[PDB]
Every structure is written in C-alpha cells, then in structure tokens.
Design a protein around this ligand. Structure first.
Ligand SMILES: [Cl-]
Length: 281
C-alpha cells in the first residue's frame, strides 16, 4: 500500500516543476487563463512574480503538485491507495482523488490564496520539543488564550497561530519551558488555521458551495479530522479546513495503521517526507 502526499506553503522554490509545464501545455494554458499570469514563469523564472507571496504560492504549488502527480502516475502506472495534502496540498489530494478537476482546484486555490493573502496583523510560530497537549497547557497556564494550534506536524512539532504581538509574548514562554528545543516564528503575516481565519473561512465556504463536487476514486485523509473524507460531507470537510488545525501527525498515523504503508511526496521539496520520518520514528 502507498499514499501520495502533497506539500503546502514552504515547499515552493523557483525552478519547481521545471519542464513539466510544456508536457501538459493544455493545463498550463488553462492555469494561465484562470490566473491572469504565466504559471510557468511564476514557478521557474527569477525575473518574474515572487513565488513566496501566498496569493501566488498556492496556485504555484497546486499546479506543480497536480502535474508532478499526473507524471508520477503515468510513469509508474500506479495510482495511490490514499492521498493527503498539507493545508494547500489537500486540494491536490481531492483533485487526484477525483473530487473536482484541475481547473476547479486552481479556481479554489486562487481564491484561497487571495483571501489568505489579505490577512494581516497575524503571526505563526513553530514550537519544537513539546506535544500538542503540552503546548495547550503552556499556552493556557501563561494566559495566552488568543493563540490557536494551527499545525500538528509531528508528535513534537506544533505550529501556533494568533495576533502578531501574541506570538511575540509566547516566545518568552516557550523559550523558558523544559523540553522546548526551538521557537521559530514563521515568515507569514496572517494567523492561518486559527479562529482569526473565521470571516475568510466563511467567504471561502460560500465559494466552495458554488462548485459541483464528484465522488472520490481514492480515499483522501482530511486535514481537519485525520480521517478519510466521508463522501457526503466533502464540501463541509474542506470548508472547515481554513480555520482549524492541520492535523497532520494523526493523518499520517491513520495511514500507518492502514497496513504496510509507503509514502511518496509528489510536488517540490522533501518537507513532508521529513515530517513523515519523524512521525514514523
Ligand atoms: Cl485495518
């Protein structure tokens, strides 16, 4: 058994998906027309749009993952038994699983990127060394009720999310707690995957409802439940994702429980392979 997993924000990098664009020139052209710019140039030319700006990152990641998948499947002959993606990457898993088509995913992640891109006054930080239980305790003991858990990445990598000044207060807390190895603020200015994504979540819910969704060929493990998408709640499970924890350690657990399980990371970088190794350890 094998699982294809799709990376999210932080895996992009100029040169990503080099040579795959002209191989799927229809998809590239379709992406160009939906986006209003050259998706090949976003991905691979240092002279054009900065791929690190979330509004562009998500379409860049989404297109590169999509195409990397089509190539893998063509090349191995094998379609995966499960699919999962981290935050942005979930949209590649639903799409590979047949929930919607290339175009539909890209429209979705364009609006995702744009809405995420206007979020302001926020901050996220990775805390390494403590459990999600432990992070929760400390947050509260120290009266930081404003910070949410945005990412459960390994059993001891937790990303926190809140107002900018709140992330700064927590620095002092986490860097003076036993078992914390690292506090590393993320290079973002929105409190993603937290209560502060509320209005954006909604605006984005209404957008999701506007599309017709197909049934899944592959089981997709949801970021929100660490469980497979229940086929009747597809839109609801996806719309719940914006302002809820990415439950990634547990989504990788569920897949290990499924049998003798292989993971392959489709898309740029080895970020998820990393998290999978540490979850497996
Ligand atoms: Cl079983």
């Amino acid at each position: 058994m094998i699982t294809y997993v799709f990376p999210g924000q932080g895996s992009q990098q100029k040169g990503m998906g080099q040579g795959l664009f002209e191989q799927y020139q229809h998809l590239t052209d379709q992406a160009d027309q939906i986006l209003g710019y050259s998706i090949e140039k976003l991905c691979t030319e240092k002279s054009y749009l900065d791929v690190n700006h979330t509004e562009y990152t998500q379409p860049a990641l989404y297109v590169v993952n999509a195409l990397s998948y089509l190539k893998r499947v063509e090349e191995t002959g094998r379609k995966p038994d499960f699919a999962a993606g981290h935050s942005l990457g979930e949209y590649n898993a639903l799409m590979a699983a047949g929930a919607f088509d290339f175009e539909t995913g890209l429209r979705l992640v364009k609006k995702r990127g744009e809405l995420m891109g206007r979020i302001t006054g926020g901050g996220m930080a990775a805390v390494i060394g403590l459990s999600k239980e432990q992070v929760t305790a400390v947050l509260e003991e120290h009266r930081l009720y404003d910070i949410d858990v945005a990412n459960e990445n390994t059993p001891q990598q937790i990303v926190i999310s809140g107002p900018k000044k709140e992330i700064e207060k927590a620095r002092a807390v986490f860097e003076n707690t036993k078992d914390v190895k690292l506090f590393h603020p993320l290079n973002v200015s929105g409190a993603f995957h937290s209560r502060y994504m509320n209005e954006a979540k909604q605006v984005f819910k209404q957008y999701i409802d506007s599309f017709q969704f197909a049934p899944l060929a592959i089981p997709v493990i949801s970021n929100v439940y660490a469980e497979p998408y229940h086929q009747d709640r597809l839109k609801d499970t996806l719309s719940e994702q914006m302002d809820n924890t990415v439950k990634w350690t547990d989504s990788i657990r569920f897949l290990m429980g499924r049998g003798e399980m292989e993971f392959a990371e489709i898309g740029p970088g080895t970020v998820l392979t990393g998290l999978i190794h540490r979850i497996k350890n």
